[PDB]
Design a protein around this ligand. Structure first.
Ligand SMILES: Clc1ccc(CN2CCN(c3c(Br)cnc4[nH]c(-c5ccc(CN6CCOCC6)cc5)nc34)CC2)cc1
Length: 255
């Protein structure tokens, strides 16, 4: 509907941002609890936001954070979001230092579903990472932040860690961007850091580009294999989500 700031009691900040802020909040009439992202039209310098709104508003899936509405204020702008009671996968990762195969395989599965769904609408997220992954009340994973997403195919800096060769190289990309990230994520869940970390934007580039990762000895054949299949330079050689969900190692450990 037509919305407004005074429909809502603000509560705690949930995270900082250069574009704005996200508060805990409660719609006054329903006592409905949600996340309000409040943005600064001043810093913005329109383009993706229109997109991140159009796209998120039109997606409903349990593993994808809901967009309920927006409204601008004209010094500010507000997205009314689903609030995710258990925080980010990123804090969960930093708290527990690394994940068992079970947690990881499950997360990946949820992720696969949400992604498969997205591609089924020709939607590429392009920025799947822990800080954009959220936990519902059941501990269910929830893809968030459709800030960089677009229709496929597409063309296009910010951190390089979860982006694929085809994208950093400025080539043309499609839904397969997400498949490379699922692999980066898988790795990072198991290991505690992404397979191309480096101290330098420029070095991480060379790593991503030449596809250079090694595994800790503690990483099983089953995961090595999946991760290796996910992380192929030529996007066409990456498995469909359907195969991903099928993978022996996935099937052996998810829920
Ligand atoms: Cl403008 C802007 C500012 C910050 C951000 C980054 N944040 C974006 C996401 N935010 C949340 C959104 Br949207 C929806 N539901 C949420 N729920 C939480 C959440 C919930 C609980 C916590 C606290 N932890 C709960 C688990 O135990 C340890 C403490 C921290 C965050 N954050 C969000 C918080 C993280 C993005 C954009």
């Amino acid at each position: 509907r037509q919305w407004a700031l005074e429909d809502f009691e603000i509560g705690r900040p949930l995270g900082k941002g250069k574009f704005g802020n996200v508060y805990l909040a409660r719609e006054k009439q329903s006592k409905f609890i949600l996340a309000l992202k409040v943005l600064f039209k001043a810093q913005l310098e329109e383009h993706q936001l229109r997109r991140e709104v159009e796209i998120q508003s039109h997606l409903r899936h349990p593993n994808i954070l809901r967009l309920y509405g927006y409204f601008h204020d004209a010094t500010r702008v507000y997205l009314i979001l689903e609030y995710a009671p258990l925080g980010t996968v990123y804090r969960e990762l930093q708290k527990l230092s690394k994940f068992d195969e079970q947690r990881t395989a499950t997360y990946i599965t949820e992720l696969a579903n949400a992604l498969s769904y997205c591609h089924s609408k020709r939607v590429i997220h392009r920025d799947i990472k822990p800080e954009n992954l959220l936990l519902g009340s059941a501990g269910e994973l929830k893809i968030a932040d459709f800030g960089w997403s677009v229709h496929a195919p597409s063309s296009r800096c910010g951190t390089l860690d979860y982006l694929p060769p085809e994208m950093i190289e400025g080539r043309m990309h499609d839904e397969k961007v997400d498949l490379w990230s699922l692999g980066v994520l898988c790795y990072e869940f198991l290991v505690g850091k992404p397979p191309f970390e480096a101290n330098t934007y420029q070095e991480t580039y060379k790593r991503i580009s030449r596809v250079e990762f090694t595994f800790p000895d503690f990483v099983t054949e089953g995961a090595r294999d999946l991760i290796s299949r996910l992380l192929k330079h030529n996007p066409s050689q990456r498995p469909m989500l359907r195969e991903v969900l099928e993978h022996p190692w996935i099937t052996a450990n998810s829920s």
